[PDB]
Amino acid sequence: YLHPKEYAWVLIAGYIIVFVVALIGNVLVCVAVWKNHHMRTVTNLFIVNLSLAAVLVTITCLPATLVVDITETWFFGQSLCKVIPYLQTVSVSVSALTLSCIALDRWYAICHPLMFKSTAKRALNSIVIIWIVSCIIMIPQAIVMECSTVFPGLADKTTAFTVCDERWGGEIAPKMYHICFFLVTYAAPLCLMVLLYLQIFRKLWCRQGIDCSFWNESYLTGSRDERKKSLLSKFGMDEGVTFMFIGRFDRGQKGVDVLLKAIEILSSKKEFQEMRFIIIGKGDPELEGWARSLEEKHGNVKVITEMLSREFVRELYGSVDFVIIPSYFEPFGLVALEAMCLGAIPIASAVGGLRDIITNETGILVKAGDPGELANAILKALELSRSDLSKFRENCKKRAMSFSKQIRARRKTARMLMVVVLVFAICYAPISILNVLKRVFGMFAHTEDRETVYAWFAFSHWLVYANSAANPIIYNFLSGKFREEFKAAFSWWWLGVHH
């Protein structure tokens, strides 16, 4: 009789630790969202769902798995031989489908051009769908689980035990079921989340975000008046209200065609004589020739096709009155953040990130396709410029800092969510390969070392339950709001504060 295992001490200890940690942590997640209305976000409603799935399996499956792995015997009868494996797979499905909808919700918010944000009622409905789908697609698992009894002995049996395992009537079905199980609970959702989070990362960290250490007013000297006077002097222009465009020259993207048409519109107006235009860029030679014809015709229009250093551009932002951003399409809007940080108040098409950045007290928005709209906005800016614009310049700087912090907050949430996904991928990797190798490829049949293989399965099961314990710990280290509410919990229980 084989009896005892060398690793039972650590398996029992690790299950006790994970049980306590997973139960308390996931309950506190629920408590944090339920007790604090400011935590009620679609992301956090999904996170609550994850914690409910983890509580479910922590209570109904973890204790059974410990006993089975230690004893290789099923003590809990026929109904629980079906119910517990069913709950386990339903919870895995809930976890991976919840993680998936977390990722899709973030992709629409951050990556989609209209930046969709889901209501809490909509999130709840999604949560209901997740549970219904999961309970339905795991019905086969409940069907296939069976207890078998074994009679060990030579002649007359004197003892017996019952084990709980899958019952297949052919070699094809278990292969197909467990192929699908790997794809539905692990492989497909992971691929979906890696792709979605790669674009999110790419938008949040690399295409969006400004060098807040380079683009600031502190590197500028003297008053804005002194600097504008000297900029126009260096550019051979008279004093006046100064508008700047900087960007590649194209039709349908950066809008220089709209600005140049708008300049033609303005040029027959008496107000045109008070305005100065600085047009910086390169591209379509037909658009370049249009700009150069206008610069030659009009003393108050300057065109720069040469490459400027970043220090030079920063001086421009810190000298001009207004920056004109007549984009058709502008997902990120670095010009607006850069210009606003240096006090230049933006006149921009209401598209994309420009519409996100610019408010009614921090710039002038115009229809992205309309040259007459841009001309009217430039005229309004001239009249604004007849008075002190300092309050407006301060509003721009403050708004740009606030946006930068806002980008930063989205980064912290996204980084935390990617860590959760990574920890899910790791914790479920071992069981997934063992399950595929065993059920699809028929390995471990011949038990030349059944001991090592059984040990690998027991570690892999524990690691699955450890995932339930890890998620609240991740939120504590990577989320300041969860950390504070966790702290509130520990103080209400150990101390009794009730904050």
Ligand X SMILES: Cc1ccc(-n2nccn2)c(C(=O)N2CCN(c3nc4cc(Cl)ccc4o3)CC[C@H]2C)c1
Question: Which stretches of the chain bind ligand X, using CB under 6 A?
Answer: 61, 64-65, 68, 84-85, 88-89, 92, 181, 428, 431-432, 435, 461, 464
Name the residue nearer to ligand OLA (CB basis): 321 or 330: 330
Report in angstroms how near the CB of residue 198 gets to ligand OLA at its nearest: 5
When CB distances are held under 5 to 8 angstroms depending on the partner's kind, the choice from ligand [N+], ligand OLA, ligand X, none that residue 329 binds is: ligand OLA
Name the residue nearer to ligand [N+] (CB basis): 122 or 248: 248
Name the residue nearer to ligand OLA (CB basis): 14 or 352: 352
Task: Tally DSSP H helices, then E strands, for the chain.
Answer: 18, 8
Name the residue nearer to ligand X (CB basis): 49 or 58: 58
By the criterion CB under 6 A, which residues form the site for ligand OLA? 24-25, 28, 113, 190-191, 194, 197-198, 201, 329, 349-352, 367-368, 418, 421-422, 425, 472-473, 476, 483, 486, 492-493, 496
Q: Which of 150, 3, 109, 5 is nearest to 453 (CA)?
A: 5
Name the residue nearer to ligand OLA (CB basis): 251 or 483: 483
Residue 37's alpha-carbon distances to 45, 120, 157, 159, 416, in angstroms, are 11, 12, 63, 58, 21
When CB distances are held under 5 to 8 angstroms depending on the partner's kind, the choice from ligand OLA, ligand X, ligand [N+], none that residue 68 binds is: ligand X
Report in angstroms how near the CB of residue 482 gets to ligand X at its nearest: 26
Name the residue nearer to ligand [N+] (CB basis): 105 or 257: 257
Residue of closest CB approach to ligand X:
88
Residue whose pair of structure tokens reads 């209209």 in the numeric block: 114
8 A C-beta contact, residue 326 and residue 368: yes
8 A C-beta contact, residue 343 and residue 361: no
Name the residue nearer to ligand X (CB basis): 181 or 243: 181
Q: Which of 253, 254, 251, 277 is nearest to 264 (CA)?
A: 277
Strand partners, 146: 165
Report in angstroms how near the CB of residue 75 gets to ligand X at its nearest: 10
Measured distance CA(24)–CA(27) in Å, rounded? 5
When CB distances are held under 5 to 8 angstroms depending on the partner's kind, the choice from ligand [N+], ligand OLA, ligand X, none that residue 92 binds is: ligand X
Measured distance CA(430)–CA(417) in Å, rounded? 22
Q: Would you give the distance in Å from CA 220 to the centre of its chain?
A: 36
When CB distances are held under 5 to 8 angstroms depending on the partner's kind, the choice from ligand X, ligand [N+], ligand OLA, none that residue 425 binds is: ligand OLA
Burial class (CB in 10 A: 0-12, 13-18, 19+), 250: middle
Report in angstroms how near the CB of residue 30 gets to ligand X at its nearest: 22
Angle at 49 between CA 23 and CA 124, to 5 degrees: 150
Question: Strands 241-246, 322-325: parallel, antiparallel or unpaired by DSSP?
Answer: parallel
Report in angstroms how near the CB of residue 393 gets to ligand [N+] at its nearest: 23
Phi and psi, residue 372, nearest 5°: -70, -40
Which H or E element spans position 199? helix 188-201
8 A C-beta contact, residue 217 and residue 343: yes
Report in angstroms how near the CB of residue 61 gets to ligand X at its nearest: 4
Name the residue nearer to ligand [N+] (CB basis): 254 or 461: 254
Name the residue nearer to ligand [N+] (CB basis): 5 or 367: 367
Name the residue nearer to ligand X (CB basis): 61 or 335: 61
When CB distances are held under 5 to 8 angstroms depending on the partner's kind, the choice from ligand X, ligand [N+], ligand OLA, none that residue 350 binds is: ligand OLA
Residue of closest CB approach to ligand [N+]:
374
Question: Strands 345-349, 322-325: parallel, antiparallel or unpaired by DSSP?
Answer: parallel
When CB distances are held under 5 to 8 angstroms depending on the partner's kind, the choice from ligand [N+], ligand OLA, ligand X, none that residue 470 binds is: none
Strand partners, 276: 242
8 A C-beta contact, residue 113 and residue 209: no
8 A C-beta contact, residue 240 and residue 378: no
By the criterion CB under 6 A, which residues form the site for ligand [N+]? 246, 258, 280, 307-308, 326, 349, 366-367, 370, 373-374
Q: Which of 484, 413, 414 is nearest to 35 (CA)?
A: 484
Report in angstroms how near the CB of residue 185 gets to ligand X at its nearest: 6
Name the residue nearer to ligand [N+] (CB basis): 52 or 291: 291
Measured distance CA(67)–CA(96) in Å, rounded? 26
When CB distances are held under 5 to 8 angstroms depending on the partner's kind, the choice from ligand OLA, ligand [N+], ligand X, none that residue 373 binds is: ligand [N+]
When CB distances are held under 5 to 8 angstroms depending on the partner's kind, the choice from ligand [N+], ligand X, ligand OLA, none that residue 7 binds is: none
Burial class (CB in 10 A: 0-12, 13-18, 19+), 397: middle
When CB distances are held under 5 to 8 angstroms depending on the partner's kind, the choice from ligand OLA, ligand X, ligand [N+], none that residue 198 binds is: ligand OLA
Report in angstroms how near the CB of residue 351 gets to ligand OLA at its nearest: 3
Measured distance CA(346)–CA(340) in Å, rounded? 7
Report in angstroms how near the CB of residue 310 gets to ligand [N+] at its nearest: 9
Residue whose pair of structure tokens reads 């006077």 in the numeric block: 229
